[PDB]
Amino acid sequence: NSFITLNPSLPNSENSVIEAFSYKCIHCYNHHKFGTLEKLREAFPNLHFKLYPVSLMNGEFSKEMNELFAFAQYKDEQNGKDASYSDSLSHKLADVYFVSYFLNKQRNFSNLDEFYDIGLKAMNVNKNEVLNFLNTPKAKEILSEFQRANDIAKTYGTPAFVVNGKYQINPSAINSMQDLEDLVKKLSNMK
Template sequence: MAVAKTVGEDKYKAAKMALYAKIHDEKTKFATGDELIRFGLSQAGISQEEFNRLKGTPEVKQLLAKWDQGIAIAKIQGIPALVVNGKYLINTKSIRSMPMLDEMILELSKK
């Protein structure tokens, strides 16, 4: 995903949406990490050669480090993870309705 993001936002979005649909909507389980990568690359229109060339670049490494830091700070453990103002992680299992979620986000955004 980081390679796709550095190549272009359109490539990143194509891979992200295709992976989301495959994993969450179709309930597909990839047998290996390589299978997942190949699928994402095909959806983004990025060749294996381009991926291999870019995956070790400083730009990709920096983006991965930034994402890792964000996950650690937010303590994200699953999807969806909703973080308000960069400091409040909403436990989505406790949400019973969209109005309840709206109220919670509004309340937390004022803190």
């Protein structure tokens, strides 16, 4: 089948596409470079777009990567943007780690401060702003939602696209931008 139905459906996912991704996943990188989410916004300007990092795939600093993406989600939403914008914090944050891993072939980060600072500088924020955010109820809610990314990723791998929190697309059904546009229009308009 071209998609499966999630049960239960995801919270805070009405009128949306969520991409579960890993910064070590070359197909994720390809969608990032290609601008898949920006192009989906172009075709579906009514939808919201969110990245779900898959912590089981993100290595030594996987918990801290989730912290930085949760912050980026919160800040982008505050600013009326989301991950389908090239200037968003979420997109900038994904870019710096994709570049680190795939184009600078950085196997590891020396230590946690070095890892964190790469994300802090990509988002042009200081550590105090992120750590203060992590003590708030909204941070715990956002991180709690990311927990589902691992189970979502086990079905078919990454990236996993999920429409309206309910319909998870089988990657074998996607062979072009047009295919993915067609499935999002079909699935976005079901119950």
